[PDB]
């Protein structure tokens with residue numbers, strides 16, 4: 001676009017995460033001594049859809065695009081580099097004396113502020129999870145993995161038939177009828193919050209995948225994690241209302257966390 005770069009501006013240092021689809025590297029942009037992350041693929045417009053969505057989004061809590069290389073293979077997307085990796089591994093491995101309750105709360109305020117931004121732009125993410133969040137210094141958390149993100153035309157996006165999703169993060173109307181909406185991102189946010197409050201447990205632990213929809217339909221929701229405040233649990237419960245209209249908006253979610261945050 002106007003976001004092209006010459007391949008030779010960047011030195012690929014080491015690999016961070018390979019794919020069945022494609023791989024991820026850390027590199028240096030010589031011309032500024034800046035560390036960047038570089039995503040790539042081989043044997044286009046899918047990989048590119050992610051590029052196109054990140055062009056349009058500019059919020060301090062969404063991993064920022066720095067450029068692209070998309071006239072010749074290998075094709076590159078380049079972004080700022082998050083030094084402490086994905087949020088899930090960060091939670092599982094941190095010092096709990098260093099990440100307190102108040103840090104966990106801060107992390108959630110950041111995420112709700114990125115989604116507040118994206119809801120107003122009418123983008124859906126479609127893969128909210130703690131594995132798809134990235135961490136930086138000072139406990140900056142940034143939302144990432146935008147490869148299923150889409151600008152919606154109205155209020156619902158329907159994915160193709162035959163399309164399979166991570167069950168424990170996906171809203172029931174999405175599992176039943178394949179319908180995504182901002183409200184289905186709300187649900188996954190809920191599930192993300194519980195991953196945070198538990199320092200990185202797996203959702204529905206010890207429940208067969210095959211039973212989740214049904215359990216849900218008959219009323220079951222995950223329980224309050226140990227140490228999690230009532231109001232944060234009630235918020236996380238509102239995210240899981242069976243009816244998408246009944247769930248909160250990301251404005252409201254953001255409002256509730258900023259408020260809790262300032263009151264500590």
Ligand SMILES: Cc1nc(Nc2ncc(C(=O)Nc3c(C)cccc3Cl)s2)cc(N2CCN(CCO)CC2)n1
Nearest residue numbers: 016017037038039063077079081082083084085144145
């Ligand atoms: C897998 C991984 N990513 C890291 N940082 C990233 N920054 C930006 C990344 C990225 O994916 N951006 C991006 C997005 C969001 C969309 C399209 C295209 C692109 Cl390019 S990935 C750090 C890291 N860690 C290795 C383990 N170490 C543990 C010690 O704490 C520390 C570092 N591992």
Ligand SMILES: [Zn+2]
Nearest residue numbers: 116251254255
């Ligand atoms: Zn707000």
